[PDB]
Write an enzyme that holds these catalytic residues in place. Structure first.
Site, mmCIF file in Angstrom:
data_model
loop_
_atom_site.group_PDB
_atom_site.id
_atom_site.type_symbol
_atom_site.label_atom_id
_atom_site.label_comp_id
_atom_site.label_asym_id
_atom_site.label_seq_id
_atom_site.Cartn_x
_atom_site.Cartn_y
_atom_site.Cartn_z
ATOM 1 N N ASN A 263 91.608 53.417 35.263
ATOM 2 C CA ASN A 263 92.835 53.801 35.966
ATOM 3 C C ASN A 263 93.851 54.452 35.034
ATOM 4 O OD1 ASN A 263 91.260 51.880 37.265
ATOM 5 N ND2 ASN A 263 92.932 51.267 38.618
ATOM 6 N N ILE B 209 98.772 56.917 35.414
ATOM 7 C CA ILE B 209 98.109 55.670 35.802
ATOM 8 C C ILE B 209 97.796 55.703 37.290
ATOM 9 C CG2 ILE B 209 98.218 53.146 35.783
ATOM 10 C CD1 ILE B 209 100.687 53.555 33.807
ATOM 11 N N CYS B 210 96.547 55.394 37.657
ATOM 12 C CA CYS B 210 96.146 55.355 39.072
ATOM 13 C C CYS B 210 96.390 53.967 39.690
ATOM 14 C CB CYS B 210 94.686 55.783 39.219
ATOM 15 S SG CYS B 210 94.297 56.669 40.778
ATOM 16 N N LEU B 211 97.681 53.603 39.757
ATOM 17 C CA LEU B 211 98.088 52.312 40.381
ATOM 18 C C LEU B 211 98.695 52.564 41.769
ATOM 19 C CD1 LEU B 211 98.599 49.342 40.366
ATOM 20 C CD2 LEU B 211 100.644 49.705 38.980
ATOM 21 N N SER C 239 89.351 53.902 42.326
ATOM 22 C CA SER C 239 90.204 55.067 42.098
ATOM 23 C C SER C 239 90.093 55.451 40.624
ATOM 24 C CB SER C 239 91.656 54.795 42.494
ATOM 25 O OG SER C 239 91.850 54.998 43.885
#
Lengths: 149, 160, 161
Positions: A79, A86-88, A119
């Site tokens: 992520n 950041i893929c949050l 993701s």
């Protein structure tokens, strides 16, 4: 001046009075608007003991809109994009202006602990997580050790 | 700094130094554990090679006598080559040498059958023997490693 | 060498120590691998000449009429290197004595093959288990030491409460 800079200021007092364990964050003395951060990789995770530094970039639509957050330190995580992004979900599709810098950093350590391969931003890491777990923890561990500089 | 304070710049370098030591210690323990497994392998090489020089002496002795009892030139040649003490030739000719022993060691179709049988037996024994030596070496390694970690863990235990 | 002395040490030098240890470890590891390869080699060589001699002792045993001759042959088949050398002289004396060039016997021979077959299959299984165990063991104990080091770290406990 504004209510946005004062909401940033409430976030500061939050960090000072109740600093979450293994996080730190402070805005530049002049610019309340930009923040230095750092997370420590929690125990029993392959990011154990890392000291990763983070940049938060705010603007004047906060707490309505979150800042843009990127890791400064060299990273290896499914992520995390090669530029720190950041893929949050709590930042991209499930944000709530009640969230503060403290909550943001806490969620990022939660992610150091729970990689989300669904993701994947960094391909290499989402794969090594599944195929060659030992090569993965080796990669992450060299990341952790460069973080110490 | 007091826990009711935000982590300061000195605090960060202190945490990192303690983490650095823990990394050093882990690589140092792993390295000394390797030190012990290597010293053990060196001792076992010394022991198996002493044992091999001795039993090869026996083989060279056996090869001179079977050389004497030989009828055909090829047999005598193989016997003399083995009596030389070559370690690779004995492995390769293990089957033909065994057949020669069975043919000359003893005072129709059933003899050739028992020869085939005992060559197979020798080869199963060679395998059993390899696996036996390797299992002995493995258990010596487990024993040495247990003795190594336990001692560090007990130093820590008294460091209460 | 101790956590307090590390706090005393300097932070670049800790990195230099880590790479001194990494390259020492790589040396040691190529050394370990060479040692093991030699040890496997001499052991399979020994295994083979021992196999030759204990197989020989069984057949020469079959041809012996004297209780003592059979005793020597059996003790040799036991496969102990020391005894093998010592009894080597008498064994040749026996071989010289009986070297001068039915149904039930092949039955035994194939019985021993099957028993050995089963013994080798087992020895292989236990070798596999032993290697697993070494790996499990290094991992187990290293983990305990890691935890001990973490539990005497104060930076840890002050960063985490």
């Amino acid at each position: 001046s504004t209510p946005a800079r004062r909401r940033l200021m409430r976030d500061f007092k939050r960090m000072k009075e109740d600093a979450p364990p293994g996080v730190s964050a402070s805005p530049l003395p002049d610019n309340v608007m930009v923040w230095n951060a750092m997370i420590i990789g929690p125990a029993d995770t392959p990011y154990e003991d890392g000291t990763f530094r983070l940049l938060l970039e705010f603007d004047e639509e906060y707490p309505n809109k979150p800042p843009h957050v990127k890791f400064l330190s060299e990273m290896f995580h499914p992520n995390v994009y090669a530029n720190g992004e950041i893929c949050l979900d709590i930042l991209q599709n499930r944000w709530t202006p009640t969230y503060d810098v403290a909550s943001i950093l806490t969620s990022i350590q939660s992610l150091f602990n729970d990689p989300n391969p669904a993701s994947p931003a960094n391909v290499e890491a989402a794969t090594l997580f599944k195929d060659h777990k030992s090569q993965y923890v080796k990669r992450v561990k060299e990341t952790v050790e460069k973080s110490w500089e | 700094s007091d826990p009711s304070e935000p982590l300061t710049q000195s605090d960060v370098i202190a945490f990192q130094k303690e983490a650095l030591f823990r990394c050093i210690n882990r690589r140092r323990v792993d390295f000394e554990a390797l030190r012990k497994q290597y010293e053990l392998s060196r001792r076992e090489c010394i022991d198996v090679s002493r044992k091999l020089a001795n039993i090869m002496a026996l083989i060279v002795t056996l090869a001179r006598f079977i050389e004497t009892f030989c009828t055909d030139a090829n047999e005598k040649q193989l016997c003399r080559e083995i009596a030389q003490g070559d370690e690779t030739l004995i492995v390769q000719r293990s089957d033909s040498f065994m057949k020669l022993l069975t043919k000359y060691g003893k005072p129709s179709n059933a003899s050739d059958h028992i020869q085939e049988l005992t060559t197979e037996l020798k080869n199963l024994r060679k395998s059993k023997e390899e696996l036996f030596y390797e299992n002995s070496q493995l258990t010596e390694e487990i024993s040495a490693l247990k003795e190594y970690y336990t001692n560090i863990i007990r130093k820590y235990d008294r460091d209460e």
